[PDB]
Amino acid sequence: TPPQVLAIGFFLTIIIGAVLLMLPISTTKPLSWIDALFTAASATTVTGLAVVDTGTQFTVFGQTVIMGLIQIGGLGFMTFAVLIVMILGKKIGLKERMLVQEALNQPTIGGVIGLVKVLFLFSISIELIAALILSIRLVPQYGWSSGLFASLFHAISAFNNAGFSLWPDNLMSYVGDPTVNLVITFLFITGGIGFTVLFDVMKNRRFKTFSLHTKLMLTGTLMLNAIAMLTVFILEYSNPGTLGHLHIVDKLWASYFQAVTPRTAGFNSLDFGSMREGTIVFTLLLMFIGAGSASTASGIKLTTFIVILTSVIAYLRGKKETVIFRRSIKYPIIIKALAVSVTSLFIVFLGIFALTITEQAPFLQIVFETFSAFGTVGLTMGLTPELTTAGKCIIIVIMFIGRIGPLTFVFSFAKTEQSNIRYPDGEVFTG
Amino acid sequence: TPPQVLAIGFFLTIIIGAVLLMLPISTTKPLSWIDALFTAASATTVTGLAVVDTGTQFTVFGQTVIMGLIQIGGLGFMTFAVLIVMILGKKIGLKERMLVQEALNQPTIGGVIGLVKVLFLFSISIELIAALILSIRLVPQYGWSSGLFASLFHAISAFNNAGFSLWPDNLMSYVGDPTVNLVITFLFITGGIGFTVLFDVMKNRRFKTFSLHTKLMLTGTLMLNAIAMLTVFILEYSNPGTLGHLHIVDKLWASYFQAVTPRTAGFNSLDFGSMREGTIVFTLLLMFIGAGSASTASGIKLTTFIVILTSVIAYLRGKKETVIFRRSIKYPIIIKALAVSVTSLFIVFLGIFALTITEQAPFLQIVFETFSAFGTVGLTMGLTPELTTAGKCIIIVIMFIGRIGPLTFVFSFAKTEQSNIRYPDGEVFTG
Amino acid sequence: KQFAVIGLGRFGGSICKELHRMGHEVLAVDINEEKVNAYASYATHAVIANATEENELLSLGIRNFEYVIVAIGANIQASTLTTLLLKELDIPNIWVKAQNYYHHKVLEKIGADRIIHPEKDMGVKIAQSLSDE
Amino acid sequence: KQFAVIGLGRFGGSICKELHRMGHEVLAVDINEEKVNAYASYATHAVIANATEENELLSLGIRNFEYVIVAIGANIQASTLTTLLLKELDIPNIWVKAQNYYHHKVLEKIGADRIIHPEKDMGVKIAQSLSDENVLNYIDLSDEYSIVELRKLDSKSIIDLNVTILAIKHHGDICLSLVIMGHKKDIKRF
Amino acid sequence: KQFAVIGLGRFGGSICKELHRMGHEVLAVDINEEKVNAYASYATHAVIANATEENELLSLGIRNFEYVIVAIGANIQASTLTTLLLKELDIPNIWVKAQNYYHHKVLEKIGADRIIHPEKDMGVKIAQSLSDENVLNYIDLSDEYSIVELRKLDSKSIIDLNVRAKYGCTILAIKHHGDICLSPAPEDIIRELVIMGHKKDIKRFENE
Ligand SMILES: Nc1ncnc2c1ncn2[C@@H]1O[C@H](COP(=O)(O)OP(=O)(O)OP(=O)(O)O)[C@@H](O)[C@H]1O
Ligand SMILES: Nc1ncnc2c1ncn2[C@@H]1O[C@H](COP(=O)(O)OP(=O)(O)OP(=O)(O)O)[C@@H](O)[C@H]1O
Ligand SMILES: Nc1ncnc2c1ncn2[C@@H]1O[C@H](COP(=O)(O)OP(=O)(O)OP(=O)(O)O)[C@@H](O)[C@H]1O
Ligand SMILES: [K+]
Ligand SMILES: [K+]
Ligand code: NA
Ligand code: NA
């Protein structure tokens, strides 16, 4: 049931948020049932896909509900449940502590309540500081009432890897601005790197003292961002639509921003609809891989990608063990990473297959939308406003499964019975 | 080196075939170096992608060279090398016997020379019978000189899973013909099911006596074809371009033919360019999966797909072992299937990425072409004639790696050194 | 009918091969992995399991078998607890291979329907042949 | 000539390395993984298998070898059952390393073409060298005639002694027409 | 300085932890998986390997270490074959933990640069402390001179006792409730002591 509580609780937050957004107080124009359900799901899954413009459709109260859904979804349902229980004086039992271990994808229950206290305190602190840093830039442009709320909204949106923006052009007017680029990128890089990784770098401060998981995430993120930044800059350098009519200083900012935003924030500074297909294909792989395992980001995690890739390379070189950073990786880690990757690919394939049946749209936009929704990235090529009601329902399911994780979703409705019986070995050729 | 001999020998057959096709005797119109190299590679990899029409561009001698390349590629380079050595009186040594084991993807060298004798004798026998069955239908339509050669060409093409056709419309004029549909489909279903599977059903004749591999292929092929036939019929029933203006009897023939031809023959009776995207998406998965492991078909084999899928489902249900047909599947089988699947997906991703850079074509056609080339299927949506020289070179590499197998190709240029040292376990979260 | 043979030894394995030869559905159970692999081709279903565990016994669908043959004849504890479980599961016929006279008495108390002494019975026939040769 | 060596010990491993050095196709079979890994570079093919199992023996294509050497000399059950399988598989030449006299008798019953006692043969040869320190090496032509390789003889010509002297070694130089061939009793006299 | 420690026991594991604490690159090698996992955090690199195999030894890049410590003192065959391999691989310094006297003799033949007897050296030092409870710790400068760290001496000044010229031993230092004094000039009050002198002369002071 711990997986069932995660699914049931997360699903309820979508319904509760949908009701609030559909109230006359939280909206300025009439809002459909599907659009309200889509916007709530896009916020609690912290995806950022927008059927309707957030700045115009919703009022200040509605945008405040969006922030609450983003914050609840980004940190996880169980993170707030423990805090509410703790404040009410109730002590965390063994059954409740097992739920936290399942929610945080932790192998052991050792110090998992202490992890919740640290991550929430870190989350509110860094967002508040980032809001202040964004405030000085965003106050002269929008005054005090709008400026402070805009900075607070984007700091929460960035740290949780949401990609929601109040402006019509999502961050497209701050391509050359170093303050917005640096603060927002720093928010979702640290927000998605992993709570356990941040905690490890907090107490331990020397690289050789970091755990294997922490070393993988720090080196993996640096290498993956560096490869992505080079790919975007080279491919899009001469593209007139994006990165063409820009200065070299602005080209580096936009290339850097568009290399880290697919994992998995979903902000943009260029129009992905006008990018060349070569850059879009690389972005598909970029946002299929996600970020830290226990973080505000989704998709198959960067460690899952590395564990499988290293395991395959080890087999191709004749090695009998998978070794990264002078550490062997056991079979239970390999099989779990393969279950995550195969189930995620199968779900994306079904979503692409279902969307092609439902909607008459170019195939590249359908593929980009499904990878964006499953990774809870929120980048669009222009398909999301044109989705039909059946298409929107498919995206909502894809976003929901992507955030909760395909393994936890399957464990919800799959019963496991333990059998101690074994079978004789069978031979089969898998060439 | 056994993997190196497979790659070097297979590459030479492409060059030798390319020279013969570029001779004035083997062609009627001038032929480019790239087109001659593409046609030879498309024949020795037994893919069937056609830059130029085979019936018009080549003369009878050229088409005879095509048959030789198809036959050599379909049965494998080492299959003919052993026969030539055997006929010359030379006995097969231990080193030579190890090459045959590597070529046939056999786990042991037990009776691998006897397998070569059986499979070649079976191959020539069934093609000759199938040619006679096709002869009675194809003689009144084309006389004796053309009719006999057309039946012989297509019987060899079908059994080896080539998809080459002498007629301009590839089998599109025999949609309702039961003789052509039954004979040709029977040729590439048995040609691709696997040589070991055919040998097992020859000696053993009761299902319970079949090996685990044989039972997987027989049940897997029946289930996969049944699912594919239903999908094509339902999705394409009302499509005016294909399967729309046809009788119900012809609809069943075309639906059945288009359900089995992606694995991996590449014949068609309908125009894949006018099919709905939903059917094309399912075909992509259909031709990414192939057929029997040691056969004339390519792609990730049906057993590789089942082994991974069953291993994932077992993990999702809490089971500690992968069991199919009351037989447990060991870890070495799982890791090899994962290496095959991951390397194949990575190669397809590179081909799609490279083709988008090189060519300005719709994305769906690029994706369909790459999956078709890597699986050595040969189905087209209309992109192959429009390929540029750089695009043709990419397809040739993709076809070559697809037929030889990504594992054998990597083992050619990767040196394996045995180290007995182990490392302490490392923990990493792969959620 | 359906037969279950538990314990693949010289006596248990001989029953599986003979019944499977005659064309009967035989479930072969043995705690040793090597034995099960050897008899995988000589049985309809061969499983590596411990017959002294009720959960593993229920995982095999042992209630579906009219005849269960317990062919463990050197491990009295494994032999007697197996037939105790099978008697609880209401198996109609339980045939057990006994080790000695005391093992025979225990199995008769815990409801073994038939008790077999393969070596003892053959030893009497061989001795009769020796005396009158 | 294709040779199979079953059991990679001090005796079996020595045969694999020497045959591989001479340029022959050798299949090295052993039940121990560490042994097979060590000799993987000294054999054309090295397999981890149990030679007492017929299915594993057929998986190696053992019928393709004219010579099979069963170099298992401390496991009588493994040695005799391996050679019983090979005889059933119609291997022309089966050479077996025997443990003791009773093992030798069994292998002769179940049809071993040649039976080898490595330690026993060397022990007899070493014991001959211990008894006579002059004797460095010898080959027994018969039960009464042998060739034995051996300060009174120093500075003495061949014609000086009227005792056939096959060869004499002179500081790494050999001369054709101290190695002597003669009767076993006569050699002791010299 | 790169150090390799082969065999992670009470002696070998202590060397790895101490060298790692001092900030040195240590390769910890052991044939037991549980030992390697325990010391994986106390070494720069920890490998599960059999040091008696040349191929496994070369896979570690053992030629890159100036110092290799073979801390295997209960397996003579494993200890001597490891050092034979290292000597063949031209390791400059090879320090080996010996089991008994015969093991010491073999290691000297096959070229061990330094041979260590941890338990035997400690046992001699402990037995000296048992014989004289006053003796707390000592270092043997030579076979006749040593430095020994030690109620009649209570409330007695340094100038009060004239063992400087009579007994012939110099008082190196006196410990005063966690406080040390260097070059203690008399008179200093002794409260209920490091002295350097001849071995026989030191015993005389303990008597009086
Ligand atoms: N708990 C158990 N569950 C299943 N099989 C078992 C169990 N204990 C033992 N066996 C198997 O039962 C078989 C017969 O047992 P055992 O060898 O002790 O008896 P035995 O009297 O020597 O038999 P036989 O004369 O038939 O060779 C063996 O293959 C053994 O592995
Ligand atoms: N059933 C078997 N199949 C294959 N190899 C085996 C089998 N049993 C033992 N061996 C291997 O045969 C080799 C020789 O066997 P063993 O050590 O018992 O004989 P030995 O007389 O001591 O050998 P040697 O004197 O040549 O060292 C060993 O490497 C052993 O692992
Ligand atoms: N061949 C080998 N290669 C590497 N490590 C080895 C090898 N053989 C033994 N060791 C390890 O060396 C360590 C020391 O060996 P052992 O425990 O026998 O010696 P010891 O004298 O009792 O040790 P100590 O007194 O330091 O505890 C052990 O952890 C053992 O596992
Ligand atoms: K997002
Ligand atoms: K084909
Ligand atoms: Na010996
Ligand atoms: Na000790």
GROMACS .gro file of C-alpha atoms in nm, chain B residues 17-141:
model
  125
  448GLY     CA    1   2.896  -0.686  -5.556
  449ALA     CA    2   2.924  -0.312  -5.615
  450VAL     CA    3   3.188  -0.360  -5.885
  451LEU     CA    4   2.979  -0.618  -6.070
  452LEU     CA    5   2.667  -0.400  -6.070
  453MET     CA    6   2.865  -0.101  -6.200
  454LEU     CA    7   2.980  -0.293  -6.509
  455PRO     CA    8   2.814  -0.204  -6.842
  456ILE     CA    9   2.697  -0.565  -6.879
  457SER     CA   10   2.495  -0.560  -6.555
  458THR     CA   11   2.318  -0.229  -6.621
  459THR     CA   12   2.114  -0.058  -6.893
  460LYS     CA   13   2.147   0.307  -6.785
  461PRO     CA   14   2.452   0.480  -6.635
  462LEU     CA   15   2.485   0.404  -6.265
  463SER     CA   16   2.651   0.624  -6.005
  464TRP     CA   17   2.918   0.498  -5.768
  465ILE     CA   18   2.692   0.564  -5.469
  466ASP     CA   19   2.385   0.401  -5.626
  467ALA     CA   20   2.588   0.093  -5.718
  468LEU     CA   21   2.733   0.079  -5.367
  469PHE     CA   22   2.387   0.136  -5.218
  470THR     CA   23   2.224  -0.135  -5.430
  471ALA     CA   24   2.497  -0.386  -5.347
  472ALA     CA   25   2.478  -0.303  -4.976
  473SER     CA   26   2.098  -0.317  -4.985
  474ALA     CA   27   2.125  -0.667  -5.136
  475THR     CA   28   2.403  -0.825  -4.930
  476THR     CA   29   2.248  -0.688  -4.611
  477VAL     CA   30   1.922  -0.823  -4.759
  478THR     CA   31   1.737  -0.499  -4.681
  479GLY     CA   32   1.557  -0.414  -5.004
  480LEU     CA   33   1.586  -0.036  -5.004
  481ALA     CA   34   1.590   0.067  -5.371
  482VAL     CA   35   1.732   0.395  -5.496
  483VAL     CA   36   1.674   0.284  -5.857
  484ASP     CA   37   1.416   0.043  -5.994
  485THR     CA   38   1.559  -0.308  -6.015
  486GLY     CA   39   1.347  -0.413  -6.312
  487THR     CA   40   1.453  -0.125  -6.537
  488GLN     CA   41   1.800  -0.015  -6.423
  489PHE     CA   42   1.958  -0.362  -6.426
  490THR     CA   43   1.974  -0.626  -6.695
  491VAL     CA   44   1.921  -0.998  -6.652
  492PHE     CA   45   2.288  -1.040  -6.561
  493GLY     CA   46   2.263  -0.755  -6.311
  494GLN     CA   47   1.953  -0.907  -6.154
  495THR     CA   48   2.140  -1.239  -6.136
  496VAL     CA   49   2.415  -1.063  -5.940
  497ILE     CA   50   2.140  -0.929  -5.714
  498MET     CA   51   2.021  -1.285  -5.650
  499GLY     CA   52   2.374  -1.393  -5.563
  500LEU     CA   53   2.418  -1.105  -5.319
  501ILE     CA   54   2.077  -1.176  -5.165
  502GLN     CA   55   2.154  -1.547  -5.127
  503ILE     CA   56   2.501  -1.484  -4.982
  504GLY     CA   57   2.374  -1.220  -4.741
  505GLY     CA   58   2.062  -1.411  -4.638
  506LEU     CA   59   2.244  -1.728  -4.534
  507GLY     CA   60   2.550  -1.548  -4.399
  508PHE     CA   61   2.907  -1.523  -4.521
  509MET     CA   62   3.037  -1.814  -4.313
  510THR     CA   63   2.763  -2.052  -4.431
  511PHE     CA   64   2.902  -2.052  -4.785
  512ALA     CA   65   3.266  -2.045  -4.672
  513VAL     CA   66   3.223  -2.375  -4.488
  514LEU     CA   67   3.052  -2.536  -4.787
  515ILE     CA   68   3.326  -2.424  -5.027
  516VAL     CA   69   3.591  -2.554  -4.786
  517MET     CA   70   3.401  -2.882  -4.742
  518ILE     CA   71   3.363  -2.938  -5.117
  519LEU     CA   72   3.735  -2.873  -5.176
  520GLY     CA   73   3.806  -3.168  -4.947
  521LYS     CA   74   3.943  -2.959  -4.661
  522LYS     CA   75   3.819  -3.062  -4.317
  523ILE     CA   76   3.684  -2.806  -4.072
  524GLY     CA   77   3.931  -2.735  -3.792
  525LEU     CA   78   3.868  -2.614  -3.440
  526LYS     CA   79   3.949  -2.254  -3.533
  527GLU     CA   80   3.714  -2.269  -3.832
  528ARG     CA   81   3.443  -2.435  -3.622
  529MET     CA   82   3.463  -2.149  -3.372
  530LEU     CA   83   3.393  -1.902  -3.653
  531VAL     CA   84   3.075  -2.091  -3.745
  532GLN     CA   85   2.963  -2.084  -3.381
  533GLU     CA   86   3.015  -1.707  -3.371
  534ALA     CA   87   2.842  -1.653  -3.706
  535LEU     CA   88   2.534  -1.856  -3.609
  536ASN     CA   89   2.514  -1.701  -3.258
  537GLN     CA   90   2.538  -2.053  -3.113
  538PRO     CA   91   2.624  -2.100  -2.743
  539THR     CA   92   2.825  -2.419  -2.806
  540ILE     CA   93   3.022  -2.575  -3.091
  541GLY     CA   94   2.829  -2.901  -3.060
  542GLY     CA   95   2.708  -3.006  -3.403
  543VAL     CA   96   2.744  -2.663  -3.562
  544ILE     CA   97   2.889  -2.800  -3.887
  545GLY     CA   98   2.592  -3.035  -3.915
  546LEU     CA   99   2.364  -2.734  -3.874
  547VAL     CA  100   2.529  -2.565  -4.174
  548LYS     CA  101   2.473  -2.872  -4.391
  549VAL     CA  102   2.105  -2.888  -4.294
  550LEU     CA  103   2.024  -2.518  -4.332
  551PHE     CA  104   2.181  -2.482  -4.677
  552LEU     CA  105   2.014  -2.800  -4.805
  553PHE     CA  106   1.682  -2.679  -4.664
  554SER     CA  107   1.731  -2.332  -4.812
  555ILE     CA  108   1.789  -2.438  -5.173
  556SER     CA  109   1.514  -2.702  -5.153
  557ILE     CA  110   1.236  -2.475  -5.025
  558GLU     CA  111   1.326  -2.192  -5.264
  559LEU     CA  112   1.320  -2.431  -5.561
  560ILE     CA  113   0.978  -2.565  -5.461
  561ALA     CA  114   0.847  -2.213  -5.400
  562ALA     CA  115   0.979  -2.104  -5.739
  563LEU     CA  116   0.785  -2.387  -5.904
  564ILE     CA  117   0.467  -2.289  -5.718
  565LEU     CA  118   0.518  -1.927  -5.826
  566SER     CA  119   0.605  -2.040  -6.179
  567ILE     CA  120   0.257  -2.167  -6.268
  568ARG     CA  121   0.105  -1.829  -6.180
  569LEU     CA  122   0.383  -1.609  -6.323
  570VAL     CA  123   0.436  -1.792  -6.656
  571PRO     CA  124   0.109  -1.698  -6.836
  572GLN     CA  125   0.167  -1.333  -6.743
   0.00000   0.00000   0.00000
